[PDB]
Structures are given as structure tokens and as C-alpha cells.
Amino acid sequence: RLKIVTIHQEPFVYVKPTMSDGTCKEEFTVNGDPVKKVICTGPNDTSPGSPRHTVPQCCYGFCIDLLIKLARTMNFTYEVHLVADGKFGTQERVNNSNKKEWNGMMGELLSGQADMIVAPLTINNERAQYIEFSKPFKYQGLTILVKKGTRITGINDPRLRNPSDKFIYATVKQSSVDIYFRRQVELSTMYRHMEKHNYESAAEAIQAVRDNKLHAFIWDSAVLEFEASQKCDLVTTGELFFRSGFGIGMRKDSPWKQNVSLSILKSHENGFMEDLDKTWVRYQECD
Secondary structure: OOEEEEEEEEEOOOEOOOOOOOOOOOOOOOOOOOOOOOEEEEOOOOOOOOOOOEEEEEOOOOHHHHHHHHOOOOOOOOOEEEEOOOOOOOOEEOOOOEEEEEEEHHHHHHHHOOOOOOOOOOOOHHHHHOOEOOOOOOOEEEEEEEEEOOOOOOOOOHHHHOOOOEEOOOOEEEEEEEHHOOOOHHHHHHHHHHHHHOOOOHHHHHHHOOOOOOEEEEEHHHHHHHHHHHHEEEEEEEEEEEEEEEEOOOEEOOOOHHHHHHHHHHHHHOHHHHHHHHHHHHOOOOO
């Protein structure tokens, strides 16, 4: 039974409480089909000041449908859990030493806490040095989320390039955005500014933009375009930059790599991936 690690990230992975009896609410997609739900154990509340607890929760969404398809095609059983530290994954020095370890889903995959990462995980060179990725199951990039009416040209906008306390922007801590910005001298400076405002999760950053507490949120276009399409007060702006793909993550020399990429290829060929977009991404107006 493979240990699958994932993360809360709508519309790829929705996380909801189980009903009183431990089951997951019966819901249906836009096509009238039952929404497939899996039990995923993980931290409940991450609000600072309250005790942490890990409990069974209900997970569903684009990546869960993909997981179910992969498991069926490759004939494997699995158990899903949410990454304990709630992060995607960057490499940092730990324990005030020079020893480096990956946090987030990356860390759990490398430690053995997980056997496969099935989430909107960005394929990048930094991570590819430590793990193996399947071919992309989704093609996307980075963009910027702002409140409707906010005027930003894109990543090269002066309010981003020449930061001040008048226009606050940020991303989610320990994600691929960090990795990207540390690759350029100029972006490194900008990330230093962002470091003072980065959020723990995408959900919190998105809410901050709606509440006028964060002026711009730099993040994955697959997620931001969905969020903006569902909330009439939020829009994305600027040309996409740092185009990239999301892939399934496995440990180095994993015997699953070939077959996982094979399944993904077939899904891109037969309409399965496109159907997932029509089910989870493009299906209704904002409300």
C-alpha cells in the first residue's frame, strides 16, 4: 500500500471534515456524477495558538481523481495523508547547522513518510536533483492575483521591482516560487521583501487579497486563474512567467516512474485530462 502525500490546494485537492459518522458527504459534479472522495489524514487547524491535531478528513478534486485513475491503471492500493508541515517543499539548513533537508512534501517523500507525491507539484531543476518526476500532468506557470481594480502590468511592474510599504506583495513560504526568485539577483532582492510578508498557505494569501491586506499574490496560474474565475472580486494580471508543469513525485530510481508517466501520456491522449479540466476548473461563472 503506497503512502501518498498531498496538500490542500483548490481545485486540485479540496479538504473537508468528515460527517459525524466518519463518512464523506455525498456530492455530485457538474455532470451529475458522484464526486469521488478519499479519506486523507492530516492536521486539522493550523491557527497559531491552538493545539495541533491529526484527524481523518475528506479529500477530492483534480489530483484525487488523477490518483484514483493511476491506482486503478497500475493496480496499486494506497493511503493518503496531508503533508504534516503544510508546505510544498524547499531545501534549507536545519537544526542551526549546515546540514540541509527538504521540508514539505519533498521532505516526506525523501524520508519515506511518503512513497509518492500526488499534488500540484512544480517540476523544477532544484527538486529534480533529489527526486524523480513524471512527465507533466498539467502545463501552467506563474501569474499574479490582485483585487479587481488594482493596476499591475506584471512581474516587471515598478510597484514590484521597486518595493515599498505602499504596495504589499508576497507568495507562500517554502514553495517553488521561493526557488525561482533565488535564481536571479534582482528577484532575490524582491523575495527578501516578500519574505517579510509571505503566507503559510495559498488559501490564507488569497483571502488576504480579498480582505485588502495583501495587494498582490504571486502564485501558480493553474490555481490563481481558477480562484479568480470563481470570485468576481479577484483577477489575475500580467503575462505568465516561469512557465512550468506539475508532475507526480517519486524517489530517485523509483520503479513506478515509467508506468506513471505512461498513464499520464495516455490521459493527455484520450480526453481524460481534458475532462478533469471541465469537471474541476472551467465549468461555471463566479459567485
